[PDB]
């Protein structure tokens, strides 16, 4: 018993047959944190217990979100999401704000709890089933079933949208200057206000959300020593690019002339006049690699010409709402990472990087994980969708640690890859 509203019939995408994923191992802490948060929900009957008779399944893990509220269980509904039907509501019903990127500050607000207020289709409830594990497999894992719009499910924001809509109508109305967006269990609020005026209008919003549909957001713990909270805000205007292309040497040797062409010959796909013909001419014979330094000024001229084409508003790019999005990472240096996001290959609509903040959080995975979390966010704020990630790491690996360095309410799609040196220049 929760909402006198009538349950909206949800059917899965034809042919598919609901999630049947297995529950990967969880640490004690996480188990407890998961147990607690879980039972208090059965008490409120947000979810019911269920036995073996329910074959379907999806996994859960909880993350230690650094906020003065509590923990956070996270169902990995990426499976059921693709198994689940479409939603004309999630698309046109939820258009995407141009100016979300254009603002000075955008805050992320976990409007998750605005979900318990709506029951899930009785017929559908078998699919959103998860299962808590147990230390050394004492007693068997207790299984639950969702009875209301579940946290992180392609439907929760669709069905609940016409509501979320009215809830913000007052706020978005008395703050036109502000830009609000909805993506999964999150609200992307952005204003051009002074940061202190923003941090005060979010809390302005972070309270209206209360007197209305008891939408409880998280209470974050701010502190003193190394002020991370001061970083929590997001500034999309402050976002840069990556036209760092241009190489530069005085003693141009064979190796350096070849490396430059290899990299420049491939770039011909990402830029117009990438004419590297006269450069090939300089390395005409079986010249001694390591020493020969043909300084030829002949090339110097059109080498500067190619340099020109490498820093400008690329011709060819375009965002097709239709096609997916892709994001590619590469361990580029010391704690430095870079990313390219594209739809139709070799015509990326945005490139950036990731440099671990000054601090003792050195862990190759941890950076990659965090990195992904960043590339994801940019996509949400910019095009309003989520990139699919080709992760430069071993699947078997990333599976052992990604939970321990992930903080978002959402989890994007990802595969694994080992692409050799060209993908770094």
């Amino acid at each position: 018993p929760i909402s006198p509203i009538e349950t909206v019939p949800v059917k899965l995408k034809p042919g598919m047959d609901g999630p049947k994923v297995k529950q990967w191992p969880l640490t004690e802490e996480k188990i407890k944190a998961l147990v607690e948060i879980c039972t208090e929900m059965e008490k409120e009957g947000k979810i019911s217990k269920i036995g073996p008779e329910n074959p379907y399944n999806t996994p859960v893990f909880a993350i230690k979100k650094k906020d003065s509220t509590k923990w956070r269980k996270l169902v990995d509904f990426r499976e059921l999401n693709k198994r689940t039907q479409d939603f004309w509501e999630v698309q046109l019903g939820i258009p995407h704000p141009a100016g979300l990127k254009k603002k000075k500050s955008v805050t992320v607000l976990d409007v998750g709890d605005a979900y318990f207020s709506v029951p899930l289709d009785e017929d559908f409830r078998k699919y959103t089933a998860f299962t808590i594990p147990s230390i050394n497999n004492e007693t068997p894992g207790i299984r639950y079933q969702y009875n209301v719009l579940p946290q992180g499910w392609k439907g929760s924001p669709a069905i609940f949208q016409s509501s979320m809509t009215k809830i913000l109508e007052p706020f978005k109305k008395q703050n036109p200057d502000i830009v609000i967006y909805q993506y999964m269990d999150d609200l992307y609020v952005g204003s051009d206000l002074e940061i202190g005026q923003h941090r005060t209008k979010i809390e302005e919003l972070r309270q209206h959300l209360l007197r209305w549909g008891l939408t409880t957001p998280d209470k974050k713990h701010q502190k003193e020593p190394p002020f991370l909270w001061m970083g929590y805000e997001l500034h999309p205007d402050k976002w840069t690019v990556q036209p760092i292309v241009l190489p530069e040497k005085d003693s141009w040797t064979v190796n350096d002339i070849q490396k430059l062409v290899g990299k420049l010959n491939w770039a011909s796909q990402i830029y117009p006049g990438i004419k590297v013909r006269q450069l090939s001419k300089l390395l005409r014979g079986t010249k001694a690699l390591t020493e020969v330094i043909p300084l030829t000024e002949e090339a110097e001229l059109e080498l500067a010409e190619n340099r020109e084409i490498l820093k400008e508003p690329v011709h060819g790019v375009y965002y097709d709402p239709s096609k997916d999005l892709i994001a590619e990472i590469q361990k580029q240096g010391q704690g430095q990472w870079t990313y390219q996001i594209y739809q139709e290959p070799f015509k990326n609509l945005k490139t950036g990087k990731y440099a671990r903040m000054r601090g003792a959080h050195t862990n190759d995975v941890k950076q990659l994980t965090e990195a992904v979390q960043k590339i994801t966010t940019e996509s949400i704020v910019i095009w309003g969708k989520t990139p699919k990630f080709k992760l430069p790491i071993q699947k078997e690996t990333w599976e052992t640690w990604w939970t321990e360095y992930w903080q978002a309410t959402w989890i994007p799609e990802w595969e694994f890859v080992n692409t050799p040196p060209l993908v770094k220049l």
Partner: antibody, heavy 123, light 108 residues
Amino acid sequence: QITLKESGPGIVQPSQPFRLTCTFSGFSLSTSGIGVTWIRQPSGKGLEWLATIWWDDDNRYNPSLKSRLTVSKDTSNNQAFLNMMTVETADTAIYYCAQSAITSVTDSAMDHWGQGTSVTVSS
Amino acid sequence: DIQMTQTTSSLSASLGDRVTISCSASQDISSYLNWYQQKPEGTVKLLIYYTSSLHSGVPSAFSGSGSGTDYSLTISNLEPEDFATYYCQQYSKFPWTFGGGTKLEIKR
């Protein structure tokens, strides 16, 4: 612009409590990053940190004195108080109220002070 | 209670001289340090935050320096105003502590 002046009893008998009030202007004890601190420089010595009153109501006291001292503020009136009970000799000194504020990820210092008030303790 | 120590208590100088004051911490303070100046009159202005960043208004001659349990404040060419007491402060552990300042007197 930004300013904060401290006001106290000037003179307080031993074993009696006192309460210095710091009024301020320019900034606000309502804005995220801000705050105010009470420093204490005893007559011919270095300044000492006593307590910082934080905007988020999470004030911090010096371990040596919380058992006798407290902080609070009425942001509405732009005042910041500092209460210390059962006062002793040693405590008699100039007390400073100071506007502190977390600027960003790593910046945190007492941005602007004020001309301390003289609390003298004696029979 | 990170203990803060300003080894040099009162240093001697002259208009033009180069002053550097040393400040040591009980434990690492990850550059969480501020420099406070106090005129003979008795007013305290903020000199620099992050043991390196210049406060506004403060002149360029002033400069932070340090890493870890040690840091230093350096005045390029001394001036009249600049002859005052200096307070070293750390904000790593919350019990905010200032290390008993350093007196900068005029040599005679």
